[PDB]
Amino acid sequence: TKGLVLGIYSKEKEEDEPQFTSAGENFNKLVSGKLREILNISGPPLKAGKTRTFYGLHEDFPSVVVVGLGKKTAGIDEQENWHEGKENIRAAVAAGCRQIQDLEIPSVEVDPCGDAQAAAEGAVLGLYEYDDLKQKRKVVVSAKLHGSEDQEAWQRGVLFASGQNLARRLMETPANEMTPTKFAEIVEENLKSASIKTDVFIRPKSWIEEQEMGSFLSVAKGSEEPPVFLEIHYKGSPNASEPPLVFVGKGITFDSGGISIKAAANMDLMRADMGGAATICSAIVSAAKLDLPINIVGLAPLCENMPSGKANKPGDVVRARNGKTIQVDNTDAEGRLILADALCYAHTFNPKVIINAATLTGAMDIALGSGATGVFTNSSWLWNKLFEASIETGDRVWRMPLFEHYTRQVIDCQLADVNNIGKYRSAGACTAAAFLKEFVTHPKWAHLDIAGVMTNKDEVPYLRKGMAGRPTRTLIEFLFRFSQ
Amino acid sequence: PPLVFVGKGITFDSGGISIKAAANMDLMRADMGGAATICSAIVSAAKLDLPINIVGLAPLCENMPSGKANKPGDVVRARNGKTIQVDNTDAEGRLILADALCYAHTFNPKVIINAATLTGAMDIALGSGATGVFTNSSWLWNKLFEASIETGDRVWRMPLFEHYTRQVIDCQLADVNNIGKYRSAGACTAAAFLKEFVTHPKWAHLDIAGVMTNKDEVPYLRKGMAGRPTRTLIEFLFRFSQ
Amino acid sequence: TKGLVLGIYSKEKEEDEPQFTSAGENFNKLVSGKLREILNISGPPLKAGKTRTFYGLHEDFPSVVVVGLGKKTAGIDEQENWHEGKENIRAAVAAGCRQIQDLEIPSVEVDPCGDAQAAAEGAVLGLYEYDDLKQKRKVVVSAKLHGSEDQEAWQRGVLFASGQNLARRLMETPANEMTPTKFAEIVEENLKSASIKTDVFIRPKSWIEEQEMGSFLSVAKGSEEPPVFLEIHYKGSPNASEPPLVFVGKGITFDSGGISIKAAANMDLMRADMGGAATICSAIVSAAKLDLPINIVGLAPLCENMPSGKANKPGDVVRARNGKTIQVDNTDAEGRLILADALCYAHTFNPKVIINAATLTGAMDIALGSGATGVFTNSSWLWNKLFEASIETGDRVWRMPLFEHYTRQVIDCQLADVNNIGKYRSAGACTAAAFLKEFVTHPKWAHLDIAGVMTNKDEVPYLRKGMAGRPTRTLIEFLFRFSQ
Ligand SMILES: [Zn+2]
Ligand SMILES: [Zn+2]
Ligand SMILES: [Zn+2]
Ligand SMILES: [Zn+2]
Ligand SMILES: [Zn+2]
Ligand SMILES: [Zn+2]
Ligand SMILES: [Zn+2]
Ligand SMILES: [Zn+2]
């Protein structure tokens, strides 16, 4: 019927016993001390992220899962660059919800754990699973707030987590279903449901040609799947003329590498090479849901990178919208090609800031793995804003260098203005970033290389194995704070 | 109390049983760059007669394959009593550093700074643009960063997160594994391995693998071994002494 | 304090509710129906291998773990070639014991589940972990039979499982600790504790040289670690002159591949290249513990395979004890070299049967993986005996071919009588077997290639991740039945 998730903290030195949250304390009282009694009988105390289940304590809650929240006053961890208490809550609540789901319980009430937004994030991110294409599926669990005192915060958590889950769905869906057109249609419907103060333009190939986006076009042509340039507007500012914030995302729905073909092992994960587009578009959907008082534009060039008799050939020179020529030495360095055109187009909006996201390089994965998203930016103010937002969400960012040292290695080009792969194999994420900078003149630009945080195995406790949708929540938080 | 510097001194690294590829293996004669830079920095500090006490520690040896060599899977005991599963014999720098870092604590130092041409991952990460610095002290990061602005021999901070530690203490036979669970973030997991042998509050690990050589990146250095970031270390010491 | 593991079966069509075992039924009665009541409250029924924990049902058992046993009458599964009921019990009991251990309970009583030997095997194999070299260790759990009616069978299970766990320990231990000498000393002490009717001879290099075992010696020389030829005798037959059964095991304590050096990835697992020696020696220790009325001889050539200035060089020709010359084309095909000499020596005992085991080829792993041990034999009677024993133990065997087709590919040799690697890359396990057959004239010989069952991830539910010690129990069962 109905399950209940309650939290308990680690015992502090002067306490005689570990303390329940307010809800746990109230429930124990409701059952005349039976919860504390049974917890004591069960043995060792619950530590952070651990769970234990007690049956039959109340007729309304046949299964009660108690979860360890760790130290009650855990705040910002100076060494980890995140709010520890929030992370403990997300992990603990996710673990509790997965136990409720294993017991095949369709609905669960969740203890706010002193921070309803974090509790909601743990439950909603934790229960998520992409199973539309399977016969065998786990029970669908409906999680709601236990109590009625922390509603806005709980709902805020549901909203943030839902945005990330939308990104996860888009990334996880196989490329034959999640084509450029399909991705555009799903984003279009989600944005329109979020707010009527939106406009969506799924720009066709003819428009792309009119816009002289030769770099983007060169990538798309190898495949039979039609390319599209998704342009979305959210008019949240009270002043329609207020300069917008522009987000740009790499939308390669499937990357085979092209003529510079990839190895077979785990190439299926490349269905998520559109993660950059997924995260920035989902962030905008969420911003619209929150009705943030700001104008935002989202740009996402979308296409496949396939080998064929029409595909990009190593050595080919293409002309970007801005007139710059690019020597395509490696057709698998295609994300930067489509981004060159989208970044150029972004300047036409005279934006306040330009932020792009892309599952750009394997080098980024070798550099930081799934620990944090690499951020390249020409603005310390912007770096700081993204960094502060990440401490709150727990979806960490780490700064990477934008030095001429790297630029020199990409403009040293045999046939053109810029080469699409560096002179050497070193610092691949840095030279890719340098390539992108040659198409940016804006003073507040940030490039997020999310290749290393594309998937999750078990690193983030509250995300099941699969595409991660990171760092969608950090982007939403940045926008929220920016709007305030 | 002295400042303690520690340097990886592998005079030649063939990789051992987990043998390296032949191409450009000659550059491994510089796998003692960590020892070279910290020892040279101390020589210079002495020349300048800086008013500070400094201790330099440099474990030195070769890593070669033979009938007596480390075998993948072997478990060894560090000076501190911790056991280490040697899954890859080419991840040897962290093995010799574990013992030197333990010994460093005996001096009750003010700070502990180690340097090592530790991982190819660092090279893939930042190349020769800057030395990667892993530190549990923002004060120390800042001091090294400011010194680097002056010398031009740049440093860039890399993360010391439990996220990476988890991947090296998840070990089949011992307390810590000498290579991570996955291939991602090699410089970060190597740093995490080193941290398991450090309890000091002001420690910095400099992975100089990417700045080991110079082609033409630094205009004033001819092609060859670079000796970076020796000047940044000297500057740090000078300012520290003042 | 004390935990309890109880089993419950899957409900049969005409039953109103799933049936507990006799012990589960008795415990429920003891607590006035409280176990059934709480199990019903907890939800969906327990299926095979699943577990659920109930707290505070009895003062003597604060934690009771109920485990799903599947269908009560599950017997031999025609398609899987094993006794299904026994497999269900081993898996269920192991899962239950791991839950008790997670709760940090030091002692547990285990329901015999209608088959005490299988229950004991699940508990003892299930709880095993090699942690001698770690600071952090799980609680040591002492498992005993619940009740006093099935003692001999429970103890038989403990004995079989202990034999396998000894093999696992020997295989898991790092090679710098588990050297040829150390392995010999550990086996020596275990055999002597098992019975006084034993003799152990840790033969030194001088003896090996006297025995003209040039093939074995050629492998050992590349390393600084002294080689030994372990010879063990168990005189269990009433007639001292009764011909013995001879077991032979490949004891490469560490295999780097030698000059034909292995790749670095996962080379640490080669510390278990002595699995052949581990399994046959452990089987003999167990046979001695059981005091089987038969004479058995165990032979295990032990050494390392390392690269150095003295190592085997590709193309070198060596002379086996039997006078045959061998062209060592690949130094990593060393197991067959040391086995050639041990198999020759085995004939001197005028044995009834000769069975050898070896983690011999990667081809075997590509062929059957961890599903079953590959068995090559010139005797269908022997194949059948091993096959029947495996149905009982669940540690499956599968027959592989001994055809001249494969022999032709190894005697087609440029410099010698036989080549240590075949003409082609196909059928690697089959040509390796053919190589071994050139050193056997006995009419009842079986070669077990255990390379594919060297480790366990999660395939065998009752074995934690690590070296498996398979198929030790099948060997013990074969010996038991043979003795009867
Ligand atoms: Zn997708
Ligand atoms: Zn690509
Ligand atoms: Zn791509
Ligand atoms: Zn090395
Ligand atoms: Zn090295
Ligand atoms: Zn071993
Ligand atoms: Zn071999
Ligand atoms: Zn071998």
Mention every residue, 6+ apart, whose C-beta is less than 8 A from residue A83: A75, A76, A77, A391, A392, A394
Q: Do B67 and C268 touch (CB under 8 A)?
A: no
Q: Could you give the 3-state DSSP secondary structure of residue A169?
A: helix
Distance, CA of A453 to CA of A445 (rounded, Å): 21
Q: Is B181 on the interface with C (CB under 8 A)?
A: no
**C447 C-alpha to center of ligand 7: Å?**
17
Q: How far are the Cα atoms of A7, A123, A137, A385, C99 from residue A93, in angstroms, in the given order? A: 8, 6, 21, 28, 21
Q: How far are the Cα atoms of C47, C270, C468 from residue B72, in angstroms, in the given order? A: 41, 8, 19
Q: Which residue is listed with tokens 């090279």?
A: B123
- On the 0-12 / 13-18 / 19+ scale of CB atoms within 10 A, A8 is buried
Q: Which residue is listed with tokens 């040039």?
A: C214
Q: Is C80 on the interface with A (CB under 8 A)?
A: no
Question: Which one-letter amino acid corresponds to residue A442?
Answer: H
β-pair partners for A58: A61
A359 carries a ligand binding annotation: no
**A173 C-alpha to center of ligand 7: Å?**
43
Q: Which residue is listed with tokens 């793995």?
A: A369
Residue C112 preceded by cis peptide, ω within 30: no
Which chains sit next to C, with 3 or more Cβ pairs under 8 A? A, B
Distance, CA of C358 to CA of B213 (rounded, Å): 48
Q: Is B139 on the interface with A (CB under 8 A)?
A: no
Q: Of the candidates A41, A44, A62, which has its C-beta nearest C55's C-beta?
A: A41
Q: Please state the three-class secondary structure of A86-126 as a single string.
A: HHHHHHHHHHHHHHHHHCCCCEEEECCCCCHHHHHHHHHHH
β-pair partners for A199: A233
Q: Do B67 and C222 touch (CB under 8 A)?
A: yes
Catalytic residue among A52, A203, A336, A464: A336
- Chain A CB contacts of C43 below 8 Å: 62-63, 103-105
Residue C471 preceded by cis peptide, ω within 30: yes
> Which listed ligand is nearest to B18 at the C-alpha?
4
Residue A204 preceded by cis peptide, ω within 30: no
Q: If you compute the radius of gyration of chain C from its CA atoms, what whole number of angstroms results?
A: 24
β-pair partners for A357: A249, A448
CB C230 within 8 Å of CB C187: yes
Chain A's closest residue to B187, CA to CA, is A367
- Nearest-CA neighbor of A342 among A208, A451, A449? A208
In C71-134, the DSSP E strands lie at 76-77, 82-83, 107-110
Pairing of strands A466-467, B3-7: unpaired
CA distance B187 to chain A (A): 7
Render the burial of B36-62: b for 16+ CB within 10 Å, e for the rest: bbbbbbbebbeeeebeeebbbbbbeee
CA distance B122 to chain A (A): 7
CB A270 within 8 Å of CB A321: no
Chain C's closest residue to B68, CA to CA, is C224
CA distance A427 to chain C (A): 24
Resolution (A): 1.6
- On the 0-12 / 13-18 / 19+ scale of CB atoms within 10 A, C484 is exposed
Residue A142 CB neighbour total at 10 angstroms = 12
Question: Which one-letter amino acid corresponds to residue A189?
Answer: E
| A319 assigned to active site | no
**A427 C-alpha to center of ligand 5: Å?**
20
Q: Of the candidates C261, C306, C466, which has its C-beta nearest B67's C-beta?
A: C306
> Which listed ligand is nearest to C252 at the C-alpha?
8
Q: Is B224 on the interface with A (CB under 8 A)?
A: no
Mention every residue, 6+ apart, whose C-beta is less than 8 A from residue A19: A8, A9, A11, A12, A25, A72
Q: Which two tokens stand for residue C34?
A: 């409280």
Q: Of the candidates C175, C224, C264, which has its C-beta nearest B88's C-beta?
A: C264
β-pair partners for A445: A354
Render the burial of B190-223: b for 16+ CB within 10 Å, e for the rest: bbbbbbbbbebebbbbbbbbbbbbbeebeeeeee
> What domains are there in chain B, each with its CATH number?
1-241 (3.40.630.10)
> Which listed ligand is nearest to B31 at the C-alpha?
5
Interface test with B, best of C129, C136, C268 (most B CBs within 10 A): C268
Query: Helices marked H in C195-271 — which ranges?
Result: 205-210, 214-220
Q: Which two tokens stand for residue B106?
A: 């005996």
Q: Which two tokens stand for residue A235?
A: 């008019």
B207 carries a ligand binding annotation: no
β-pair partners for A375: A399, A448
| C408 assigned to active site | no
Q: Is A421 on the interface with B (CB under 8 A)?
A: no
Interface test with C, best of B172, B178, B182, B196 (most C CBs within 10 A): B172
Question: Which one-letter amino acid corresponds to residue A82?
Answer: W
- Chain A CB contacts of C105 below 8 Å: 43
Question: Which one-letter amino acid corresponds to residue A259?
Answer: I
**C305 C-alpha to center of ligand 7: Å?**
7
Number of H helices, E strands in chain B: 7, 13
**A198 C-alpha to center of ligand 3: Å?**
29
Please list the active-site residues of B.
20, 94
Q: Could you give the 3-state DSSP secondary structure of residue C307?
A: coil
Q: Which two tokens stand for residue C14?
A: 């005409």
Catalytic residue among C336, C385, C464, C473: C336
Q: Is B156 on the interface with A (CB under 8 A)?
A: yes
Q: Which two tokens stand for residue C121?
A: 């095997």
CA distance A369 to chain B (A): 5
CA distance C129 to chain A (A): 22
Q: Which two tokens stand for residue B240?
A: 């520290």
Distance, CA of B194 to CA of C282 (rounded, Å): 39
CB A200 within 8 Å of CB A231: yes
Q: Compute CA C191 distance to the chain's CA centroid, rounded to the nearest angstrom.
A: 17
Q: Could you give the 3-state DSSP secondary structure of residue A253?
A: strand
Q: Do A366 and B184 touch (CB under 8 A)?
A: yes
Which chains sit next to B, with 3 or more Cβ pairs under 8 A? A, C
Distance, CA of B4 to CA of C33 (rounded, Å): 69
B15 in the Ramachandran plot: left (φ > 0), alpha (ψ -120 to 50) or beta? left
Q: Which two tokens stand for residue A152?
A: 């806005």
**C333 C-alpha to center of ligand 7: Å?**
5
Q: Is B152 on the interface with A (CB under 8 A)?
A: no
B29 carries a ligand binding annotation: yes
A395 in the Ramachandran plot: left (φ > 0), alpha (ψ -120 to 50) or beta? beta
A329 carries a ligand binding annotation: no
Distance, CA of C425 to CA of C333 (rounded, Å): 13
